[PDB]
Amino acid sequence: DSGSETAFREIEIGDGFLPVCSLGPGQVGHLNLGQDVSSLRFFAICGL
Amino acid sequence: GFLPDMRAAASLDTATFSTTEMALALNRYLCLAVLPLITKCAPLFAGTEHRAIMVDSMLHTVYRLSRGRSLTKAQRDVIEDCLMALCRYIRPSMLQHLLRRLVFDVPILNEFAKMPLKLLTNHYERCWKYYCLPTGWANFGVTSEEELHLTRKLFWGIFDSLAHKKYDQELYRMAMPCLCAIAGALPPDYVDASYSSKAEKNFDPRPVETLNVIIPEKLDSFINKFAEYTHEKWAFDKIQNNWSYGENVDEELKTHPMLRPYKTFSEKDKEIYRWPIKESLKAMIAWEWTIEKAREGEYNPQPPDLSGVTLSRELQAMAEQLAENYHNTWGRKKKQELEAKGGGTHPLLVPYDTLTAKEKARDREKAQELLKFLQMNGYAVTRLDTSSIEKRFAFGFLQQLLRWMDISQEFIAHLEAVVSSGRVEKSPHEQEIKFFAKILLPLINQYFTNHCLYFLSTPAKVLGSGGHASNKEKEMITSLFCKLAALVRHRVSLFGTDAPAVVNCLHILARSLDARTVMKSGPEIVKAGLRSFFESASEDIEKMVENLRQNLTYTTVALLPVLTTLFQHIAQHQFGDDVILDDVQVSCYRTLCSIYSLGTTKNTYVEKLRPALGECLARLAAAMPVAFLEPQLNEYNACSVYTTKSPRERAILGLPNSVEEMCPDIPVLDRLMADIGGLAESGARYTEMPHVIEITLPMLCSYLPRWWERGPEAPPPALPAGAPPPCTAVTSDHLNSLLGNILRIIVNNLGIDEATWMKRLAVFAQPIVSRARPELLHSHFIPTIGRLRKRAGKVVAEEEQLRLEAKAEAEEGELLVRDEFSVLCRDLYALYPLLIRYVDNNRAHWLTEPNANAEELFRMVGEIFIYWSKSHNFKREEQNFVVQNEINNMSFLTADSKSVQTSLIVATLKKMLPIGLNMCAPTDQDLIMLAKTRYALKDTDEEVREFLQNNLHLQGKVEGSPSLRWQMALYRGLPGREEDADDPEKIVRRVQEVSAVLYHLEQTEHP
């Protein structure tokens, strides 16, 4: 709303971080952690 | 010790003991030792919910100490500061008793009543989400029904008290924030259970006089039967409570001590328990309620009397009035004993419509039981219909605004009459005028600002936290808007001091309005008034255009901004088809012809007002639902007047059966394109032709987007709907040409000093520059930016020469090149937003497939950023230009639609940075860092190229790291990438450019 690019900031490192996804009833979704850049899409846009 | 001693002081407050020497000693002791400690510990006073019990009494005694007499103003200030600091760090949960006790003194509006309103406004400003939002605010929770009722009553009490009281500058100024805070806190759609307005009245409940009037005894067979049946049902309550009836007096038996069967039941209690029933029935018949016996007939009661069944609403309302009579009689008989002391009041000594249901339950149950006893036997008693929508707070508030509005129109008509004939100072309604001006306008302004979302929401589309507003509310809001429009139509000259407030309120009320539901099945009076509003506005615009060749001040001050915001809101909410039609269509079309007829005029007035008209007609084009231009296909459009009306109805509306004839002044859309392209090719300057740039360019930039989606280029989702030819046949080539023409104009006119409208033209073209053809880069981006960089480098060279020479002439030349840098900043800030749009739109394609033109533009903007970073003159003149023209606002707008200095880095080294970053191989990063080290040693461009040539072998190895493994894999897997980039010359060029980019970027971050 304020225009900040980053969703969050100043996050403490602590123990660490892990990818996570939660889905409701009747909802399907594909998760690509990035095992292969060939299957990884939109990587070269921002991530790379 | 502390609390007992301050109890003692609050008790000695009495005027008899107020002058006692040790009473003043206690006052000084408290105000000098105890109270400051409480203020200091107030931040820690937070929470304490567990100990709120003492906190309550402690709040009460601090308030009573502030209320104490025989106290110095300094001591009063200390106690008030303690109250304020305490309430600042206290959960709103335990503050209900304080507010309830304050309700006695809040609407008195005495001298001593000012600090209560200050505390109330601070409390409600702190707790805003606690009342409006049903969601619990933190762990404090949500407002209670009693709290919402209390704040409603307090709001209305201040409203009425301050309306009746004569104007006082101090009272008005300090009390209006309190009313604004209460209005913001109270939800618009609150529906109190006891919405009926008693309109009466410390608290002295007057009973009903019924002993003087003779009580009819024609229904004594019912009166005595019910009198004994009350005691019989009491015995039934005992047996349901599982207690038998006792014969003799006994304290262990909570049941009636002489409750005996009718065989052994003495009549001494029977002939004395009937009196309450007598009182109730006598009061019932004393009120206008005639009772008729429709029927004619007639130790535990076999027939059961209950109260859990439903009953008619009006009869239950009469029973509610009788329960109110019960409660107020109880209050009178209690306050007769309580008034002997003169200090304090019973906790339940509140009006019946004010008390909550839990304490109402006893009287309500008694009344309902008596009513059921009437109902089953069949006694017909005969002598309002308020719905929940009427019970809503917004409905009553709007009704009050309409009432004070008719009063306002009356006394402003009187003001106009007296100012026209001489000058009358002492107006008979001066208090009303000052109230309506000073407090009423800020109140509605703030209330509508904080509850704009609620009124704008529809039942189908829940827009905001609030669900929706009723259609009747949505039409009274429009009626109020049009009525204040009617007032400002003539009386703008009057109350010129308050005129800014009037126009701000008009701007606010132009929003949060569903004009769609206003027109569709809306009230005829409101619709006709609003239609007459557009008609009057159009005739006024005609009056101004004829005058250019009181209305002048009215138009410029109020009509153009407010009604321009009107079209802006219409375009935002897609009201064009619903609002602009029939007579509204005719009026806005006439406004368009009048506003375009001013092209011939070239006087100072039209030149200075031309930007305002440009904004207004841009809004006309945005909100206008028919293709005024390219009118050969206007028949296909349903919203056109020709389509809506039959030929005869067109004749009666004034249509000459020729769409082109009403406005031949504006040529066709195609012609526009030809004219603007020709002017761009000839390089016509802003001074050479102001009218086209200031007027027709808004036509293009607002016409093309709105009708592009419904045009042939964007296929309609509904094929049957799109089967008729589109009314507007614009394609992507139209917009492209328009943008090119605009840019051609920008590149042609760049040395014109004080070309202020460059920035506004950039603003209007900022939406239209997107959805652009890819070839526009090589068309008109690299050449313009290259010419700009040549100019910037020339001025930087002059600055460098002028700083290497040292003299007063050098300082004067430094000032001159500072002015030159300022005009450079103006031009570059004008050019950048369209560049930002273009690079954002085309970035993904450029990253996926490399583009040499994009790389050249990257080098160009990089060199420009190098110039800006190295030149302090550029930075300071950018600061001056930003602060002078408020271009920081425009920069933020561009940023959010993609700091003060960030316009020089987002367009050079932030958005387009990856374009230049991808040229270098992932294995050249070693050379890039080494070049950065050279820059850290401050080595020139040729010299860093030399070290790249010597240390080309210092490059990384693909085998060196797995990161480099997959990075090189991706780099060679890029489709547009080739092996020709391995040339050492290309490597050193790209490494030097990227390294300089990064070095100067980090220098900008930290010198």
Give the best residue of B843, B847, B925 to mutate against chain A (max A CB count within 10 A). B847
Question: Distance between CA B570 and CA B706 in Å, rounded?
Answer: 13
User: Which chain A positions have a beta carbon within 8 Å of B970's beta carbon?
Assistant: 37, 44, 48
Cβ proximity of B927 and B954 under 8 Å: yes
Is B715 in contact with B632 (CB distance < 8 Å)? no
Nearest to A45 among B847, B895, B970 (CB): B847
B281: Cα separation from own chain's centroid = 53
Query: Residue A44: which of B847, B892, B966 has the nearest Cβ?
Result: B847
Residue in B closest to A2 by C-alpha: B896
Of B459, B461, B443, B369, give the one whose Cα is nearest residue B400. B443
- The residues, any chain, with a CB within 8 Å of residue B429's CB and separated by 6 or more, are B407, B410, B411, B414
Do A44 and B848 lie within an 8 Å CB cutoff? yes
Backbone breaks in chain B after residues (C–N over 2.5 Å): 201, 298, 383, 549, 898
The residue in chain A having the minimum alpha-carbon distance to the alpha carbon of residue B842 is A45
Nearest chain A residue (CA) to B922: A48
B815 contact partners, CB below 8 Å, separation of at least 6: none
Residues of A in contact with B895 (CB under 8 A): 3
Rounded to 10 degrees, what is the CA torsion of B712, B718, B722, B727?
A: -70
Cα B106 vs. chain centroid, distance in angstroms? 28
C-alpha distances out from residue B455 to B156, B181, B187, B449, Å = 21, 19, 12, 11
What is the Cα–Cα distance from B732 to B776, expressed in whole angstroms? 13
Give the span between the Cα atoms of B874 and B863, in whole angstroms: 14
**Cα–Cα–Cα angle for B733, B739, B743, nearest 5°?**
145
What does the DSSP 8-state code read for residue B380?
E
Q: Which of A37, A40, A41 to mutate to test the interface with B (most CBs of B within 10 A)?
A: A37
The pair of structure tokens assigned to B683 is 């390089």
Distance CA B782, CA B622 (A): 32
Contacts of B966 in chain A (CB under 8 A): 37
- Contact between A3 and B895 using a beta-carbon 8 Å cutoff: yes
Between CA B478 and CA B476 the distance in angstroms is 5
The residue behind tokens 């030159």 is: B820
As given in the structure block, the two tokens for residue A5 are 């690019």
Cβ neighbours of B749 (radius 10 Å): 20
Q: Are B349 and B331 in contact (CB under 8 A)?
A: yes
Residues linked to residue B392 through DSSP beta bridges, in sequence order:
B191
Residue of chain B whose alpha carbon sits nearest to that of A1: B896
Which class for B101: exposed (0-12), middle (13-18), buried (19 or more C-beta within 10 A)? middle
Q: Residue B43, Cα to own-chain centre: how many angstroms? A: 32
What Cα–Cα distance (Å) separates residue B557 from each residue in B442, B487, B501, B543? Answer: 19, 14, 12, 15
Tell me if A44 and B970 make a contact (CB, 8 A cut-off): yes
What 3-state class would DSSP assign to B381?
strand
Would you call A45 and B895 a contact, using CB atoms and an 8 Å cutoff? no
- Chain B positions touching A3 (Cβ under 8 A) are 892, 895-896
Residues 6+ positions from B446 with CB-CB distance below 8 Å: B180, B183, B184
SS3 B687: coil
Phi, psi of B653, rounded to the nearest 5 degrees? -80, -15
Contact A3 B848 (CB under 8 A): no
DSSP reduced 3-state for B291 = strand
Q: B-side interface with A, Cβ within 8 Å?
A: 844, 847-848, 892, 895-896, 966, 969-970
CA distance linking residue B677 with residue A14, whole number of Å: 62
Return phi, psi of residue B289, to 5°: -140, 100
Nearest by CB to A45, from B844, B892, B895: name it.
B844
For B877, other C-beta atoms within 10 Å of its C-beta total 21
Looking at chain A, which residue has its C-alpha nearest residue B917?
A48
A3 contacts chain B (CB < 8 A): yes
- Determine contact, residues B851/B838, Cβ cutoff 8 Å: no
How far is residue B196's CA from residue B192's CA, in Å, rounded to a whole number?
9
The SS3 of residue B289 is coil
Q: In Å, how far are B484, B501, B570 from B530, measured between CA atoms?
A: 11, 22, 14
Q: Residues B542, B546, B549, B553: is their CA dihedral positive or negative?
A: negative
List the single residue in A with minimal CA-CA distance to B896: A3
Cα distances (angstroms) measured from residue B488 to each of B268, B442, B482, B491, B957 = 76, 17, 10, 5, 78
Residue numbers in A near B892 (CB within 8 A): 3
Q: Does B969 sit within 8 Å of A44, measured CB to CB?
A: no
**Token pair listed for B878:** 């950018």
As a whole number of angstroms, the distance between CA B586 and CA B415 comes to 35
Q: Is the C-alpha dihedral spanning B820, B821, B824, B826 positive or negative?
A: negative
* Pairing mode, strands B290-293 and B379-382: antiparallel
List Cα–Cα distances, B580 to B124, B629, B640, B664, in angstroms.
42, 16, 10, 21
**B573 CA to chain A: closest CA distance, Å?**
20
Distance CA B289, CA B1003 (A): 90
How far, CA to CA in Å, does B183 sit from each of A17, B31, B176, B180, B400? 46, 35, 11, 5, 14
- Closest CA in chain B for residue A3: B896
> Are residues B883 and B901 in contact, defined by beta-carbon separation less than 8 angstroms?
no
- Identify which of B452, B450, B473 has the alpha carbon closest to the alpha carbon of residue B572: B452
The neighbour count for residue A20, using CB atoms within 10 Å, is 6
**Which H or E run includes B675?**
helix B669-682
Closest Cβ–Cβ partner in B844, B896, B970 for A37: B970
d(CA B563, CA B571): 12
CA distance B392 to A3: 37
Q: Look up residue B379 and give its DSSP letter.
A: E
* Token pair belonging to B62: 């601090």
Q: Please answer yes or no on whether B969 and A3 come within 8 Å at the CB atom.
A: no
Residue of A nearest to B847 (CA): A45
Instruction: Look at residue B851 and give its three-state secondary structure.
Output: coil
Please answer whether residues B758 and B799 qualify as being in contact, where contact means their C-beta atoms are separated by less than 8 angstroms.
no
User: Which of A3, A37, A48 is closest, CB to CB, to B896?
Assistant: A3
Looking at the complex, report in whole angstroms how far the Cα of residue A37 sits from the nearest Cα belonging to chain B.
8
> DSSP label at B783?
H
Check if the beta carbon of residue B195 is closer than 8 Å to that of residue B386.
Answer: yes
Backbone angles phi, psi at B292, to 5 degrees: -125, 145
3-state DSSP call for residue B549? coil
Cα end-to-end span (Å), chain B = 63
- What crossing angle do the helices spanning B524-548 and B604-623 adopt, rounded to 10°? 150
Any idea what the Cα angle at residue B810 is, between residues B805 and B811, rounded to 5°? 135
Q: What is the CA radius of gyration of chain A?
A: 15
DSSP 8-state assignment for residue B626: S
At which residue do the structure tokens 């809004």 appear? B619
User: Taking a C-beta distance cutoff of 8 angstroms, is the pair B869, B938 a contact?
Assistant: no
> Which tokens hold the place of B413?
């008509």
Amino acid residing at B798: E
CA dist., res. B539 & res. B545, Å (int): 10
Q: Which residue(s) pair with B290 in the sheet?
A: B382
**Collapsed DSSP state (helix, strand, coil) of residue B711:** coil
The experimental method, as deposited, was cryo-EM
- Indicate if the alpha-carbon torsion angle B708, B575, B769, B897 is positive or negative: negative
E strands in B424-513: none
Burial letters B697-728, b for 16+ CB under 10 A, else e: bbbbbbbbbbbbebbebbeeeeeeeeeeebbb
Burial of B342 (0-12, 13-18, 19+ CB in 10 A): exposed
B445 phi, psi to nearest 5 deg: -55, -55
A37 in contact with chain B, both atoms CB, cutoff 8 A: yes
Residue B983 · residue B895 · CB < 8 Å: no
The single residue listed with the structure tokens 């219909």 is: B385
Q: Looking at the complex, report in whole angstroms how far the Cα of residue A39 sits from the nearest Cα belonging to chain B.
A: 12
